[PDB]
């Protein structure tokens, strides 16, 4: 079976700046309900600091992949386990600030 996943881009603070419409099937929200919000706003309280620390560290890992698992609040107010794999991108023809690219998959915690 196809795992359910969608791509997102974030600023280095965590705010959604781009959301792939596969998010509707994965977590129930339209992209516009996520754009402009920090991903931490959808995260379980027990996972929120881990998620903040993960966004902080991915910019230190020399563009390599960092993965995090956390509980994401779906459009039905239910906690769904997500596995977010993230890495930074910076175009070497520029000195513009790096941003973060994520792939977000619903996973089992078992």
């Amino acid at each position: 079976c196809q795992p359910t996943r969608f791509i997102s881009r974030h600023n280095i603070e965590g705010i959604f700046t781009f959301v792939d419409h596969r998010c509707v099937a994965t977590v129930g929200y339209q992209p516009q309900e996520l754009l402009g919000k920090n991903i931490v706003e959808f995260c379980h309280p027990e996972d929120q600091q881990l998620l903040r620390d993960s966004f902080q560290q991915v910019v230190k890992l020399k563009g390599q992949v960092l993965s995090v698992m956390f509980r994401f609040r779906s459009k039905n107010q239910e906690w769904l386990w997500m596995r977010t794999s993230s890495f930074t991108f910076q175009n070497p023809y520029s000195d513009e600030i790096e941003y973060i690219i994520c792939t977000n998959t619903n996973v089992k915690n078992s």
Partner: peptide, 16 residues
């Protein structure tokens, strides 16, 4: 930090 980081899940849709 946004107010949304602090709402109970069961209140999140009504707060939005």
């Amino acid at each position: 930090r946004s107010a949304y980081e602090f709402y109970h899940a069961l209140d999140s849709e009504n707060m939005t």
